Design a protein around this ligand. Structure first.
Ligand code: GNP
Ligand code: MG
Length: 166
């Protein structure tokens, strides 16, 4: 499955990917273009695209909308000065024709920091309960500390799997 990871600059996209890859986050720098990582877990082959979020390169996001199987949107839960910007960019994404029906996982990141907003507050600001056109989930997490990441990825896998029924 092809996974696309978006969100504002500094939200923690690359740190989450390296945490999933069991590698060192000490040496992470802002992403000028994008990163690709292949990950095999629980009988699944994930190809993950992590795109840089600085506004200057944000128009490039649309290059990667084709053949997307799931969207992960990352937000810095402790940076309330940037919430309006994060909601504007997500609402634009959800109006894209190429992303019709694609499952949405929101990672409410940096829960380890003082003043981090709870998942329910973030859900309210992003107006997630008004979505009608796709499956969605919000998950609180800390990439520095590893919590929440497994739970999020398990929800996402359930949505993209070929499911067998009786
Ligand atoms: N306290 C804390 N800091 C975090 C957490 N996740 C990431 N950070 C920090 O936040 C900063 C930005 O992380 P980074 O992964 O580069 O963000 P990004 O979303 O990839 N930015 P860009 O899109 O510009 O590449 C880094 O200093 C990183 O260590 C977290 O869960 N807790
Ligand atoms: Mg990055």
């Amino acid at each position: 499955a092809r996974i696309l990871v978006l969100g504002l600059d500094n939200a923690g996209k690359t740190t989450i990917l390296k945490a999933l890859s069991e590698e060192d986050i000490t040496t992470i720098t802002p992403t000028q273009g994008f990163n690709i990582k292949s990950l095999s877990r629980d009988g699944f082959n994930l190809k993950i695209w992590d795109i840089g979020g600085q506004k200057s390169i944000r128009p490039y996001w649309r290059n990667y909308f084709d053949q997307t199987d799931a969207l992960i949107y990352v937000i810095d839960s402790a940076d309330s000065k940037r919430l309006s910007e994060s909601e504007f960019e997500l609402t634009e994404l959800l109006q894209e024709e190429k992303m019709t029906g694609v499952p949405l996982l929101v990672f409410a990141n940096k829960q380890d920091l003082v003043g981090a907003l709870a998942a329910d507050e973030i859900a309210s600001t992003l107006d997630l309960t008004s979505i009608r056109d796709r499956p969605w989930q919000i998950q609180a997490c800390s990439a520095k500390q590893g919590t929440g990441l497994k739970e999020g990825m398990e929800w996402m896998m359930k949505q993209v799997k070929l499911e067998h029924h009786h």
